[PDB]
């Protein structure tokens, strides 16, 4: 069943419920929230890349009864987030993690793996 989002960074982003394990392999929201903490500086700083939406689509995926399996952000979203926050990442000496490899995500118009675009 779906559960309310407890991950502070993913509250109030336009869907209310997620379900664990997430797309990152986290057993619980507390574990997910901890792994997400390294991204907190980048998310407050506005790198205009929809980083919050992208991260939360993977760390706190939307859950509804309408769909069985999670719908992650599309690859193009991963890539635009990576590029737009790339300079501010150089300043904080933050390297984009191997776990967020954008090549892993589907893009739009794959009928078997749906993905989300940003609101």
């Amino acid at each position, epitope marked *: 069943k779906c559960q309310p989002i407890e991950i502070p960074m993913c509250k109030d982003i336009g869907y209310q419920m997620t379900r664990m394990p997430n*797309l990152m392999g986290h057993e619980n929201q507390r574990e997910a929230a901890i792994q997400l903490h390294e991204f907190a500086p980048l998310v407050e700083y506005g790198c205009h890349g929809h980083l919050r939406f992208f991260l939360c689509s993977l760390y706190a995926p939307m859950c509804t009864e309408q769909v069985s399996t999670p719908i*992650p952000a599309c*690859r*193009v979203m*991963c*890539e*635009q987030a*990576r*590029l737009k926050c790339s300079p501010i990442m150089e300043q904080f000496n933050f390297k984009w993690p191997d*776990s967020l*490899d*954008c*090549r*892993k*995500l*589907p*893009n739009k*118009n*794959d009928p*078997n*793996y749906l*993905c989300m675009e940003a609101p």
Partner: antibody
Amino acid sequence: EVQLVESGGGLVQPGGSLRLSCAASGFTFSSFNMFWVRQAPGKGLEWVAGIDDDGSYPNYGSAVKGRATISRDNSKNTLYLQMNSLRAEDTAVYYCAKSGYGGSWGGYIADDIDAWGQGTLVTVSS
Amino acid sequence: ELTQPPSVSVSPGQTARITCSGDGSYAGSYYYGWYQQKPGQAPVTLIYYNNKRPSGIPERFSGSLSGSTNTLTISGVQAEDEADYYCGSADNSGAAFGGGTKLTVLG
């Protein structure tokens, strides 16, 4: 050094079925995405299917989607391909191929295949 | 959609350039690998992740991404580089290969 050895090639009638397996050795199999790639006689490489480390997000090329199942058994370091309703134009050398990275949420890209099998020939004919 | 010239000619010691073009209108990033294949053999990987060379591949092979195009450059071409060359990448429909370039070494 990586070895990928395919088997299961042979002759099949149109509308028949194929089952390929690939035995992988030399590397930590369960940490890498694996692919099937095929080549019809005198033609180019065609990506057939791909599967992630755990076996959880199989995807397929256009020509085989809906007729194909890619799977793996990590306990036996073995990758499998199953295909139905075979067409003559499915005649091809089928290659087992190992990716240089692991993980997928349904997406695959053929930018880092780093080991190739020797291929096994499937002949589709009456 | 992934596009390669079907054929290229070089004479020995010269530089050959083989390109793979994808969808320039795409708003994200691109990734290419290059695979060499000789008649009757399996492919051999020359370049992965746009510009990385496996150890054991001669230094005269290199790749580089510009825009939506990746170019394989073979400097100082040898007769033993005569082969078909395929880029590996992704279409709008998923993982995919280019149609292949036949590279002829003259003389």
